[PDB]
Amino acid sequence: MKLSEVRKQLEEARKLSPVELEKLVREKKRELMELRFQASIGQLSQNHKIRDLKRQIARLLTVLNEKRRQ
RNA sequence: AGAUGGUAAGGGCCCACGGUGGAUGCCUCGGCACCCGAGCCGAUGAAGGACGUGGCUACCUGCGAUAAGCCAGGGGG
């Protein structure tokens, strides 16, 4: 995923409430599973999308953790 | 009547060239000694591990279900 898009994901991410974050993760986590399935049947040529989503879920959770910790 | 050479089944010594084998010289990502710097870690769960972790991954390295990585500051180009 693009550098600029990362920064953009973070800005909008840091504006969410934990619940919105929790909900957002669950969907991107669901999208990861959808990706894995098509990856299974050789129907995902844009395979970089898998690594990409994994780190989004990472970046979200990191921020979810940010929200809670002080 | 007498006498003396060509035979090499195979073998021996020398010479040429190969095979095998990995000495020798050169080489060094490693080691060895001395000197200096530096010296604790852990229930806020250590040292050391197990099992996992990649779109395709046997192993090593890294990492821990956020899993060859996540956030921020500094360095760099």
Ligand SMILES: [Mg+2]
């Ligand atoms: Mg990043």
Ligand SMILES: [Mg+2]
């Ligand atoms: Mg004769």
Ligand SMILES: [Mg+2]
């Ligand atoms: Mg002969």
Ligand SMILES: [Mg+2]
């Ligand atoms: Mg013969």
Ligand SMILES: [Mg+2]
């Ligand atoms: Mg002889």
Ligand SMILES: [Mg+2]
């Ligand atoms: Mg020879």
Ligand SMILES: [Mg+2]
């Ligand atoms: Mg020499």
Ligand SMILES: [Mg+2]
């Ligand atoms: Mg000393």
Ligand SMILES: [Mg+2]
């Ligand atoms: Mg020490």
Ligand SMILES: [Mg+2]
């Ligand atoms: Mg350990």
Ligand SMILES: [Mg+2]
């Ligand atoms: Mg688990």
Ligand SMILES: [Mg+2]
């Ligand atoms: Mg920087």
